Design a protein around this ligand. Sequence first.
Ligand SMILES: Cc1cc(C(=O)N[C@@H](CC(=O)N2CCCC[C@@H]2C)C(=O)N[C@@H](C)C(=O)NCc2ccc(F)cc2F)no1
Ligand SMILES: Cc1cc(C(=O)N[C@@H](CC(=O)N2CCCC[C@@H]2C)C(=O)N[C@@H](C)C(=O)NCc2ccc(F)cc2F)no1
Ligand SMILES: Cc1cc(C(=O)N[C@@H](CC(=O)N2CCCC[C@@H]2C)C(=O)N[C@@H](C)C(=O)NCc2ccc(F)cc2F)no1
Ligand SMILES: Cc1cc(C(=O)N[C@@H](CC(=O)N2CCCC[C@@H]2C)C(=O)N[C@@H](C)C(=O)NCc2ccc(F)cc2F)no1
Lengths: 217, 218, 215, 215, 222, 223, 223, 222
Amino acid sequence: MEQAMRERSELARKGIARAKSVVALAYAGGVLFVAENPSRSLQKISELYDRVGFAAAGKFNEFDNLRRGGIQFADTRGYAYDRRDVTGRQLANVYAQTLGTIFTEQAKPYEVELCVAEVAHYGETKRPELYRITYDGSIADEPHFVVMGGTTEPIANALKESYAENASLTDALRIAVAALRAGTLGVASLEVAVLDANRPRRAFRRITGSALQALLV
Amino acid sequence: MEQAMRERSELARKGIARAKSVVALAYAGGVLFVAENPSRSLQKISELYDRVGFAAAGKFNEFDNLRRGGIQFADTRGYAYDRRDVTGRQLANVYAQTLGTIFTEQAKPYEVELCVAEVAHYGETKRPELYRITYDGSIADEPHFVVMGGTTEPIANALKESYAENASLTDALRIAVAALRAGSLGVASLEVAVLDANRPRRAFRRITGSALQALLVD
Amino acid sequence: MEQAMRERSELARKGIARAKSVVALAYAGGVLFVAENPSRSLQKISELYDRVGFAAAGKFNEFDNLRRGGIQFADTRGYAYDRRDVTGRQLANVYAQTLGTIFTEQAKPYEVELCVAEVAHYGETKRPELYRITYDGSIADEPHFVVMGGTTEPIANALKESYAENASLTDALRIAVAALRAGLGVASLEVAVLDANRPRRAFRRITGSALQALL
Amino acid sequence: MEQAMRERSELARKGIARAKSVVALAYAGGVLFVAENPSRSLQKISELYDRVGFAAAGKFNEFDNLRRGGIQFADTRGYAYDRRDVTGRQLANVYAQTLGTIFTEQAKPYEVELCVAEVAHYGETKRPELYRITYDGSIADEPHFVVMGGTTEPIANALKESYAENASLTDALRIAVAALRALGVASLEVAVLDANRPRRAFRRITGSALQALLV
Amino acid sequence: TTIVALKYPGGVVMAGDRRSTQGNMISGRDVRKVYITDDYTATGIAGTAAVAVEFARLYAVELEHYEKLEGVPLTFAGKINRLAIMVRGNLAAAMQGLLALPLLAGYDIHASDPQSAGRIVSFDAAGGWNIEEEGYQAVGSGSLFAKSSMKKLYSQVTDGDSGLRVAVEALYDAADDDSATGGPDLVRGIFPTAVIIDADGAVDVPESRIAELARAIIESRS
Amino acid sequence: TTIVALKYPGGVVMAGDRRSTQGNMISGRDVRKVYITDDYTATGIAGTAAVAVEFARLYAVELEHYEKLEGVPLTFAGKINRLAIMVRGNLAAAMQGLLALPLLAGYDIHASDPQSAGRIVSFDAAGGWNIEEEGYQAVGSGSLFAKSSMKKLYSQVTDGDSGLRVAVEALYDAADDDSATGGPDLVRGIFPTAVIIDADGAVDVPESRIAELARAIIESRSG
Amino acid sequence: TTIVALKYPGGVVMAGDRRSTQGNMISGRDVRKVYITDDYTATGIAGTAAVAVEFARLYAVELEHYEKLEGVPLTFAGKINRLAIMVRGNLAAAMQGLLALPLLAGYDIHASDPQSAGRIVSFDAAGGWNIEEEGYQAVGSGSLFAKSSMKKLYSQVTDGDSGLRVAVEALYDAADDDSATGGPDLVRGIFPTAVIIDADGAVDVPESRIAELARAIIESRSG
Amino acid sequence: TTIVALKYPGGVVMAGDRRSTQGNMISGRDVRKVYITDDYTATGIAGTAAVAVEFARLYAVELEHYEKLEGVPLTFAGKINRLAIMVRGNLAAAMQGLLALPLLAGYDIHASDPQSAGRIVSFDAAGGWNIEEEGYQAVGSGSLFAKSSMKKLYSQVTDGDSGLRVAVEALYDAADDDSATGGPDLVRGIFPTAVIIDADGAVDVPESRIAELARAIIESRS
Ligand SMILES: Cc1cc(C(=O)N[C@@H](CC(=O)N2CCCC[C@@H]2C)C(=O)N[C@@H](C)C(=O)NCc2ccc(F)cc2F)no1
Ligand SMILES: Cc1cc(C(=O)N[C@@H](CC(=O)N2CCCC[C@@H]2C)C(=O)N[C@@H](C)C(=O)NCc2ccc(F)cc2F)no1
Ligand SMILES: Cc1cc(C(=O)N[C@@H](CC(=O)N2CCCC[C@@H]2C)C(=O)N[C@@H](C)C(=O)NCc2ccc(F)cc2F)no1
Ligand SMILES: Cc1cc(C(=O)N[C@@H](CC(=O)N2CCCC[C@@H]2C)C(=O)N[C@@H](C)C(=O)NCc2ccc(F)cc2F)no1
């Protein structure tokens, strides 16, 4: 029993440790996702729902399976009730249940770490919410930032000394890429997006290409 | 768990290492597929959809199951939505999920490596896209070429120092055949095909017989 | 995993290596099947479809299973499309898939080796096709002959030395019986032919005094 | 994999080794089944169909399940087609398939050995056919006799030394009993596939009549 | 039946008659057709008594089920969608006589203005719904009479009290012209039930108040 | 439609017309209704064209399927029973207008006397069959005409040429009295299809032989 | 009901009336029948209020579902096929009185010429669709009147604002001849709803603009 | 609707009208009823517009599906079998009004004689089929008119140009007697669609060529 679960835990951890790292932090305009991703078309950050965003680390097919399941959950609940009943807390909760089931019952555990974020609805005053779901269904409520994958202690500490609330978009971005480096890196090796509390309905936005370049400098 | 996934990984990897080699290559007119293959009718390169092609290394019946599954998926999406909604990205994504599941839950993992390629729709300007999907669901977006099966380091090196994005069909073909030899060769031992971005609708086209001979010689 | 597949592979290979041998070779008239076979009623060679024939080596109940499954496939596809859509390539393809599944998932792997052959339709020019499918679903395209069962090496070499394209029925038959011996009269032989000169059903058995006359 | 299959093989092999023995042989009047059977009411020899008879050695409940499944097969096929389409080779073939499936898949392999025999239809001239299906689905086509169960080699030897084609009923019976000792009416189950009866060839030879024959 | 609902400054009121019939025969005098379905919501239901009550019961259990599972109550929009889905699910039965046709009155705690946050939602037997912008609405065999009354009396609604008065007098006119709607029964002491909902939640209106208003309308007419 | 079948010494012959209709309208002129179902048997079917043809194709596949699976062809009795089972299976559809009423002719290689090995089997829509002992049979909308014709002409049947003559003439009478059965079309060259079966197997009668017999019948009846 | 759509240079407009009935009885004065279903498409459905709304909502959800799952929206063709599939799915209910008949207006961000990137797609109850090439379309009980009116007025459409006036006018005529289509209600201040779509996306038309167009139409047709 | 198909020396031509109705009301002027279903095959379908188009789309997808799965296209006999099966599969819905009656035209790359490799196959609603041997066929509400026209005009079919002209003229005669088949529209410039197949494949006939043919026919009849 306990040996099986220690093995599953280790296989998973070693999976996530060997993955490229990801950071999502609260900033003045909402929440920022910055991910080490050289791919041209395969994405690790994603929209879940109107004000709810998603980012993961680990094995791509597994956390993409989870992203898709989450979009299914969100759209279904929004339809059967109302759009405004879909919340980040809910999706973190279902991811917790889903990953716990996966971790105890599936042939192999998912080598995955997940971050669900929510910003306020348009015109409302509400602190952004970050949640981290680890491979075994553990769920953590985080106030300022979330760090996932690779070697996290360096990046988390970098942020812990450089993170300041109400940061602007460029400041927050540079703090995030700086923390990532502690673990040369520009448009071609980054996937960036934001939950932008200023947009009226769909808050998820990718910042790519000329825009991202402009913001890095 | 650890030993099980350990020797699953070893069994797939070594199955693929003993299989003939295959090369997919961006060239001036689209994508070129060249596979070491002695059969006249048994195929490891195949059309998937209008502008999307497929190549595989490893155990034939397994990558053929996968090829058939992919044709099923593409024809189904195209009919459910419109043909223009089928992309190489989608097929690669579905292959990574499928092969991940196979790898963790099937009696034997599949001894296969897959390449999905896509070229521009007719009249459009879009650099080809090449995707590699390995036995465990890992997926990699690649810029110029993909090498699968057998001993890949030599062939990748030959292409890295020989590759030309703007080569002609003939040039790209002899580059690919050269690299395949450097990984160890005529019409009777090759399967060649192309995703031709110049065709109006279906870009997939095989290059057989005296035509393939013409491309090899002079 | 590695343990299991090693065991399954060796069980299959030992089974087949203990079984009697079978040869199929292309000759001027079509395809010739010759199998060492002492039974008078139990058969190792079979018709599949109009121009497609089947030969198997190993455990009878298992390759008879796969023979019935092939006939099911052939007839069902021919009814669903047209008779001419059925090919040896696709029968061989589905046997590849089937033995692959069997080999990895049945309680015991099948101890069988399979050959599927096609000849041209009446009045057309098409080199015969020969396919060899082994117990793990591996499939091979062969131009001249296919050897299955028992010690395949002596027979394969004998055929490599003695095989000539477009032999006579008599000469192909002699070459075959001779390569077989390297690892035999009427009463110990089952012989059949895919006869490209038959109008629709090419499969024909050469039995009794007719076989004797060519021996 | 090879472990399981070895243990299965020798479990069934030893089971059959311990069982009483059964012989079946072709004679001038059809086919004769003679088995050692102390019971007065439990049968090891059975009619399957018009001209098709069944005999078995080993564990009773298992070869009785197979006997019943065979009758089911014959009555279903004769009904689904015509009576005349049911052959001994058809029953022997499906017994092969079944015993193979049992052998690889059942919780315990069956400890049985089966003989299926067929005599000519009334008024025809057809050599009796004898089939022997072993515990692993292996099947064999026999021209003169089959021995099953217990120590088969003494009996096989006796018959190979004492067997004569077209023997009379009383003689074949004598030789058969003799081979079995290598045994009176109360210890013998004896039946015949009588090729001179119009429809159903199977008839037991029991009690007084059996004694008159043994005398 | 007549169920009525109307918006007044800072709240909403809903009121329903007490009559049950089978054809022409009076089978009940004291049935309740208006239910507090949660702290900020009442549903009045016309149709088959059993299906109506079943709807109210199920609906309240459903809204609270969500609230306990998710830690927060459904938005008003979601509450509407769940009632509407219930009605649509019953259409097949409703065509065979088992009809539940609801009317929703709520107070939206999330709305901007705590004086216009009152909500009245009408439904049709397919589950179609509409949020009533003109201040009042009614359902049931007497709903036309009730609506044509409130059309004239609605200018008198200035607070909870006058709104309840107009609601009970609408129910009165309904009873005057529809025999399937019960009027105030002064002999037995049975009167329409009513709920009023404001920022402080939904509350049952004391019978004695409705009786007072009924006696005042009755006296007024004679 | 009219399909006819009849025995002649040492074999059997089956012929069928070529017409396809939708009410009064002629929708087809060259349809084929008589089919070599295997080396020794032909089935001809009347009713709805799609279901008729479907039956013929599936029944042929079934016989050859048994023969390949078992190494031996079904007995003639088994062939009958399989056709009857198919027919019974179609009954509900047949009552809703998807009708298939067949007629079977063949040569029984396992019969006693090659002198009387020809077989004519008729069916009804519930799947009942009967092995005709009086030498001829017909099915389809023109069947009673063709059978009364053959009732007068059968004594003229002494070999396969006479048998094929009598069957073409039966079809001719049938088309003469039943507008849903087509007669010979001399303008277009379309004549009934015919199978003749003996110990050497079932073979198609070339169109030109039917043409010749047609012209003989016409000229016989005009003068 | 009357819903109209038409193409103007560079864009499309769609407008719908506000009326809900049960038989003769007016059960709604402010219902919304035209909906922005994605950033570049609007859908307007006639039929049973409940099914029509449910369609608009579920369709928007399906389009955004695809966009989130695959990182890119459906092609316009795909969007059409999904609406058609929904309608076909509802057919049996619609033949029992739960009808939803949509009219689709859109701007194709992948069309060749942006000035004619406008798209107007009409549907029938079976899910058959046609992309309208003569520039306008209408659905609902008043769509005949609206379409004849537009046949006469379309030549005046030279831009978005004249397209909006023509759409409002078509709805006016419709309400003039069809009691199940509501006209502008000047006492209550309720007017048709309008969506307009160009390269910058789909935007709701403010009620005041529709009100001005309506009052102009009314004064025009008066003294 | 009217769809026509005819063989000409070395190929085949199919053409269809453009009209869509609902009873007497004209609901479509430019609908397409003839579809290149693969490199050597076109199918035209009469009946319920939605069902006809669905049949063409799914049919071509089925043929290409087989091609990419097996590496080789279905024989012509196999394409016929598959279309037939689709129709028989739809019989139940067809009885209730979702009808789809196809006409198949093709060029058999495996036929013996290239000059007679053209194929025309007609179908009935039960899935029965027939390979036409007399040169021409038609389908839809106007097909009797079109076939009776072609019967007179077919002797003039000596090449693809004559074949195309005779086809368009049959569509013209149909539209002249069947209000559910649309004639050439000169005001709008809408003309029948047409596809021609020979050894080089199946190709769409440009609208302007159909227009020239149309005017020549009208002229010739005035
Ligand atoms: C299929 C069927 C219908 C009926 C029926 O007509 N049932 C009557 C109700 C009735 O006779 N009853 C007395 C005993 C039990 C309880 C109840 C009170 C009804 O439903 N009549 C309809 C016309 C009606 O009056 N509906 C009013 C109403 C609305 C909402 C509500 F909650 C309660 C109500 F009574 N019975 O079976
Ligand atoms: C459900 C349905 C039935 C029909 C229908 O009546 N279909 C006609 C046949 C017809 O119009 N067709 C032309 C296009 C296709 C092929 C075929 C030839 C039929 O079935 N008619 C019956 C009454 C008939 O004539 N049957 C004769 C017949 C018998 C056996 C056979 F094999 C073929 C035949 F045509 N249509 O839809
Ligand atoms: C089975 C059934 C049908 C009906 C019915 O007639 N339902 C009416 C709608 C109605 O009475 N209502 C008021 C309260 C509820 C919601 C809505 C506002 C309808 O559907 N009438 C048709 C004739 C109609 O008016 N349709 C207009 C329309 C079109 C699109 C849209 F989105 C909304 C609409 F109201 N009731 O039960
Ligand atoms: C259950 C049902 C049937 C109908 C109906 O009659 N639908 C009409 C089609 C129609 O009104 N439409 C305009 C808007 C949408 C698309 C289409 C173009 C039809 O099917 N009519 C039949 C009689 C017809 O005219 N069919 C011609 C036709 C044939 C083949 C083809 F591919 C397309 C066609 F329009 N509506 O609901």
